[PDB]
Amino acid sequence: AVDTAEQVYISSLALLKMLKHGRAGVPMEVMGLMLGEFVDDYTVRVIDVFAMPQSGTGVSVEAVDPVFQAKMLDMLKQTGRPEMVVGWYHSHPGFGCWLSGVDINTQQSFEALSERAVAVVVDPIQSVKGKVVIDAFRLINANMMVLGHEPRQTTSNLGHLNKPSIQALIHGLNRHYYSITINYRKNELEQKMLLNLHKKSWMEGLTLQDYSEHCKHNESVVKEMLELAKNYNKAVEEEDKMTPEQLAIKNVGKQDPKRHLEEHVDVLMTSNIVQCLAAMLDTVVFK
Amino acid sequence: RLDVFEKTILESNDVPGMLAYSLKLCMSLMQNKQFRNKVLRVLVKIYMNLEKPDFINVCQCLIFLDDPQAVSDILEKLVKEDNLLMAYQICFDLYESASQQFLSSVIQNLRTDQTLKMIKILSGEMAIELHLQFLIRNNNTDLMILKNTKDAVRNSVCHTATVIANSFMHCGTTSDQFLRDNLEWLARATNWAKFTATASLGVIHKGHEKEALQLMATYLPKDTSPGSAYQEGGGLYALGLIHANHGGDIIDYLLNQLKNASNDIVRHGGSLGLGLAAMGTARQDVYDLLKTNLYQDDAVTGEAAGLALGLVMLGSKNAQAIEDMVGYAQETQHEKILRGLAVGIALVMYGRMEEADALIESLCRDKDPILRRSGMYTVAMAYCGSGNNKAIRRLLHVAVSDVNDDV
Amino acid sequence: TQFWFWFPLSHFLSLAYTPTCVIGLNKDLKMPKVQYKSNCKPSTFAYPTAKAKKKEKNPARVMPAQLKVLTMPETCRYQPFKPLSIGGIIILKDT
Amino acid sequence: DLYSRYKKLQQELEFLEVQEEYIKDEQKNLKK
Ligand SMILES: [Zn+2]
């Protein structure tokens, strides 16, 4: 229909609430509401996420208890920030994350309250480490198919939408759905203290403790895996000396003949762990 | 050294133009402006002490050294000399090369025959209408190309490409034949191909002084009042597309039309056209309304202000303007304001070679991807033509390192 | 370069187009009539020999590489006294 | 021509400086 620039802001707590609540109830689509602030025409800013309670034991079925609305928003009024609801979410846990018939069913009833209340889909399965996968959508009408649907200001967002993407059925659901870009702004305070946590708190408390424990390893436990290393670096070696012989025998470097390889580099890296933690001994133990 | 170089040009050699292509060498590989002027200023002392009359070299140093008094000196001498044939080249290459502050500051020295000549040479409109006359008498185009690219009909953004294309191939011709031949295909897209059409009208009319306002009086917003917002908002934008680089009654025309207008649909073309006609001219009284255009607390007119707030102050680095821009674009909640003022703070600094670096380090510093991208545009614009390898290091370095795609 | 975020930024490209025409004017307005020569072959001049011919002032369109293969008219009436190495407006002196 | 033929080589020296600095950071970045 009449479109605008497509842009969705986040909160950093949001994504975590999404993944936790969509993981803890995984095989059934778990309803959840979404809370934020309509700043303007084209950007929407979710700032808070609270999950919905569950009901009877069936896929995709959803409800909005209004006493839960009143009491939850009341608690968030006596919490420091009360703000306006901005939409909702659930998961499509086993697939390529398209809104189902029940999803568009609650969308045509939910769209009469808010215009740009954006439906969002988290998936805790098709993301491993380098995917969110954040996936939000927006419903189109059927009355305005006499008119066009195609102003699409700031053209980059659409061409960006077609790349994160697959299916025959998403391709069948470019009707009734046009997505919207999601991006991420991060507090440098929060970024730096998450860096504190996950580049400092993977090192452990007082920080001497586990390195002196490695120093405990280096004179009691290492010699056993050094015996394992020496037995490997005899047994693997007397047959990997057959390998340049057979390289001279068969061809100049053709296809893979069979199972084994050199594999020594990994065992040598474990020996490098041995020497570095043996270097730790002088440093820690003395002074 | 200056004076042993003065000794080498005071020799017993047949030198037609070694003192011209060595000046090309002086312009090509120069380290700083601290040494270019030290070479250049005594060369024209020996040129005005040379027996043969030579005007291309004093013209060269004149447009280089940016002196609003030496041009008036030699122009006074050539108008006193009573030959307008030799007081021709200096005057029109003078109008061609340099900036608006230079000509508009030497115009006082020219009115400190001789009164009509400065109007002939410093207004310089007639050269623009001469090439415009070349553009209307010379029409080598094709409609069949637009037929082939016309009957590939899609209701998409493609309308904007078609109207910008037939404004491309019909620049400076002042002919609305694609408003003659069809009327309903133009009226297919909403508000945005319509702004693009009413601005393509201005693209057809670049450098067009005579029939400008009376040709766009069809689309003045106070009489017809179309239901489309940017359609009535695009007239002043097309006027600014006409009268770019020069200020006339367009400044005093839009200056009260941007006060009493509609809501923030008309300011987007108005301030763009007003700072486009006043581009590089450092007009304070458009910067004044650009201040409230900045503080409208809206970013769709924030981009109006974001373009124009740099456009009016090209190459000036008004130290309070940098403060205004970066001190409004930190606490804002939008992004169009950020990117418009990004372009603006890039545009205000232009050809400084060292003087932008205090700002460049600050714009490199911030966690904002928009503002790092802004520093990239600023180091792009302050170093136009700079073969110096100061910018390229951090430039291509953050082209390696940074995580946003647009930066 | 950045035209997505404001679609009217396809319009500033008209200011990038520059005049490339070989002019010459003997007074502030007067147009004489003269045709001078080029040294190239008449097929690279096309924009869909012993000499090419140009205009008398409208001026003639020109190639940025054909700015040096021109020659001022030595046999006709009006002659540009200044060395003509680019287009644009110059003097076309009568002898 | 030796003024030109000597002055233009400083540009290429600066270029080799630039790329020798550049491919190091490229090589470090590509493992990430
Ligand atoms: Zn679902």
UniProtKB/Swiss-Prot annotation, chain A:
Pfam families: JAB (PF01398), RPN11_C (PF23594). Residues 8-143 form the MPN domain. Keywords: DNA damage, DNA repair, Hydrolase, Metal-binding, Metalloprotease, Phosphoprotein, Protease, Proteasome, Ubl conjugation pathway, Zinc. The modification Phosphoserine is found at S127, S201. Zn(2+) binds at H90, H92, D103. CDD domains: MPN_RPN11_CSN5 (cd08069). InterPro entries: JAMM/MPN+_dom, JAMM_MPN+_peptidase_M67A, MPN, RPN11_C. One of its GO terms (biological process) is double-strand break repair via nonhomologous end joining. GO terms for cellular component: cytosol; cytosolic proteasome complex; extracellular region; ficolin-1-rich granule lumen; nucleoplasm; nucleus; proteasome accessory complex; proteasome complex. Widely expressed. Highest levels in heart and skeletal muscle. The modification Phosphothreonine is found at T243. Its EC number is 3.4.19.-. Belongs to the peptidase M67A family. PSMD14 subfamily. This is 26S proteasome non-ATPase regulatory subunit 14.
Curated annotation (Swiss-Prot), chain C:
It comes from the Eukaryota. Coiled coil: none annotated. Component of the 26S proteasome, a multiprotein complex involved in the ATP-dependent degradation of ubiquitinated proteins. This complex plays a key role in the maintenance of protein homeostasis by removing misfolded or damaged proteins, which could impair cellular functions, and by removing proteins whose functions are no longer required. Therefore, the proteasome participates in numerous cellular processes, including cell cycle progression, apoptosis, or DNA damage repair. Component of the 19S proteasome regulatory particle complex. The 26S proteasome consists of a 20S core particle (CP) and two 19S regulatory subunits (RP). The regulatory particle is made of a lid composed of 9 subunits, a base containing 6 ATPases and few additional components including PSMD1. Interacts with ADRM1. Interacts with ZFAND1. Belongs to the proteasome subunit S1 family. This is 26S proteasome non-ATPase regulatory subunit 1. It comes from Homo sapiens (Human). The chain holds residues 767 to 917 of 953 of the full protein.
UniProtKB/Swiss-Prot annotation, chain D:
It is found in: Cytoplasm; Nucleus. It comes from the Eukaryota. Coiled coil: none annotated. Component of the 19S proteasome regulatory particle complex. The 26S proteasome consists of a 20S core particle (CP) and two 19S regulatory subunits (RP). The regulatory particle is made of a lid composed of 9 subunits, a base containing 6 ATPases including PSMC4 and few additional components. Interacts with NR1I3. Interacts with PAAF1. Interacts with TRIM5. Interacts with ZFAND1. Belongs to the AAA ATPase family. Component of the 26S proteasome, a multiprotein complex involved in the ATP-dependent degradation of ubiquitinated proteins. This complex plays a key role in the maintenance of protein homeostasis by removing misfolded or damaged proteins, which could impair cellular functions, and by removing proteins whose functions are no longer required. Therefore, the proteasome participates in numerous cellular processes, including cell cycle progression, apoptosis, or DNA damage repair. This is 26S proteasome regulatory subunit 6B. The gene is PSMC4. The chain holds residues 39 to 70 of 418 of the full protein.
